[PDB]
Amino acid sequence: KTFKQRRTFEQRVEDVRLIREQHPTKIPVIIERYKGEKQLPVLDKTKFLVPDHVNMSELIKIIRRRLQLNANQAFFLLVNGHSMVSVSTPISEVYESEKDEDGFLYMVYASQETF
Ligand SMILES: COC(=O)c1ccc(NC(=O)C(F)(F)F)cc1
Ligand SMILES: [Cl-]
């Protein structure tokens, strides 16, 4: 079901190495619905190439636009399994501290803060 489950550590590593060589200015992001989630829809895809200059506040806005949410639907975004300390951090900086050993940046969303 989940991305890590579908692809071998070997395959996730190689894909990240390709994105480096074909989309060098992009952060390779895995974005996934919380397995519990009842309310929000599933995304049309899993793997996103995010411009390395957008901050986390703008990435939340992008995903809310991609889910076509409305103003008063709740949305929470975990990064590397935990809460974002700050939405104003640039995704280039977030990547350098929160990336996985395979080289993706893993995110999970829900309507509840309690995942
Ligand atoms: C130079 O701009 C692009 O080609 C480009 C890159 C990524 C995305 N999409 C997202 O950030 C996503 F996936 F989170 F919605 C949209 C356009
Ligand atoms: Cl690029």
Side-chain angles (χ1 to χ4, degrees), residues 1-111 113 115:
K1 270 295 222 303
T2 74
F3 187 70
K4 279 196 173 162
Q5 286 175 351
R6 291 192 259 117
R7 309 278 299 169
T8 76
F9 185 89
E10 191 173 324
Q11 278 170 340
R12 293 184 259 107
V13 154
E14 272 317 302
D15 200 8
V16 162
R17 278 179 186 167
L18 172 73
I19 302 177
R20 268 184 216 151
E21 205 77 58
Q22 283 186 0
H23 309 269
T25 79
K26 304 299 172 42
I27 299 315
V29 181
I30 304 307
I31 314 180
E32 287 194 304
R33 194 171 69 152
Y34 176 56
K35 61 204 311 302
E37 181 59 31
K38 294 321 195 161
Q39 319 308 332
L40 299 168
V42 301
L43 292 169
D44 58 298
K45 73 189 189 159
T46 300
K47 191 180 70 146
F48 298 92
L49 306 193
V50 188
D52 83 336
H53 61 89
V54 315
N55 72 21
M56 294 300 303
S57 172
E58 175 57 28
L59 184 52
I60 290 156
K61 285 189 200 157
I62 290 165
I63 297 160
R64 289 177 66 83
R65 282 193 298 271
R66 185 142 200 142
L67 291 170
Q68 279 286 278
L69 301 196
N70 54 68
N72 48 15
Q73 289 165 271
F75 176 93
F76 301 95
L77 194 64
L78 295 187
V79 184
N80 181 39
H82 56 84
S83 273
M84 293 164 34
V85 183
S86 175
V87 307
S88 74
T89 333
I91 200 179
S92 44
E93 267 171 58
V94 178
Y95 179 77
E96 275 216 3
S97 79
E98 299 300 327
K99 60 192 184 280
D100 199 84
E101 290 213 327
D102 71 6
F104 283 104
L105 186 58
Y106 288 89
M107 306 198 178
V108 182
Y109 66 85
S111 10
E113 243 164 328
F115 282 66

PDB file of all heavy atoms in Angstrom, residues 23-26, ligand 2:
ATOM      1  N   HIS A  23      16.135  16.909 -12.566  1.00  0.00           N
ATOM      2  CA  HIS A  23      15.407  18.000 -11.887  1.00  0.00           C
ATOM      3  C   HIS A  23      16.245  18.441 -10.709  1.00  0.00           C
ATOM      4  O   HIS A  23      15.831  18.320  -9.571  1.00  0.00           O
ATOM      5  CB  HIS A  23      14.010  17.544 -11.504  1.00  0.00           C
ATOM      6  CG  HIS A  23      13.270  16.934 -12.646  1.00  0.00           C
ATOM      7  ND1 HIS A  23      12.464  17.678 -13.476  1.00  0.00           N
ATOM      8  CD2 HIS A  23      13.223  15.662 -13.097  1.00  0.00           C
ATOM      9  CE1 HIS A  23      11.921  16.882 -14.370  1.00  0.00           C
ATOM     10  NE2 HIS A  23      12.380  15.646 -14.166  1.00  0.00           N
ATOM     11  N   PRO A  24      17.454  18.955 -10.983  1.00  0.00           N
ATOM     12  CA  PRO A  24      18.416  19.300  -9.942  1.00  0.00           C
ATOM     13  C   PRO A  24      17.930  20.391  -8.975  1.00  0.00           C
ATOM     14  O   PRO A  24      18.406  20.396  -7.852  1.00  0.00           O
ATOM     15  CB  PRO A  24      19.656  19.762 -10.727  1.00  0.00           C
ATOM     16  CG  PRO A  24      19.068  20.261 -12.047  1.00  0.00           C
ATOM     17  CD  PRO A  24      17.930  19.302 -12.327  1.00  0.00           C
ATOM     18  N   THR A  25      17.013  21.278  -9.384  1.00  0.00           N
ATOM     19  CA  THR A  25      16.529  22.355  -8.477  1.00  0.00           C
ATOM     20  C   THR A  25      15.293  21.915  -7.683  1.00  0.00           C
ATOM     21  O   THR A  25      14.766  22.782  -6.956  1.00  0.00           O
ATOM     22  CB  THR A  25      16.255  23.691  -9.194  1.00  0.00           C
ATOM     23  OG1 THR A  25      14.990  23.569  -9.825  1.00  0.00           O
ATOM     24  CG2 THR A  25      17.327  24.104 -10.172  1.00  0.00           C
ATOM     25  N   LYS A  26      14.850  20.651  -7.773  1.00  0.00           N
ATOM     26  CA  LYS A  26      13.595  20.188  -7.119  1.00  0.00           C
ATOM     27  C   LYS A  26      13.878  19.274  -5.920  1.00  0.00           C
ATOM     28  O   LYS A  26      14.816  18.437  -5.967  1.00  0.00           O
ATOM     29  CB  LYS A  26      12.732  19.414  -8.104  1.00  0.00           C
ATOM     30  CG  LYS A  26      12.367  20.165  -9.377  1.00  0.00           C
ATOM     31  CD  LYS A  26      11.568  21.419  -9.121  1.00  0.00           C
ATOM     32  CE  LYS A  26      11.382  22.269 -10.364  1.00  0.00           C
ATOM     33  NZ  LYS A  26      11.070  21.436 -11.547  1.00  0.00           N
TER      34      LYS A  26
HETATM   35 CL    CL B   2      15.500  21.543 -12.236  1.00  0.00          CL
END
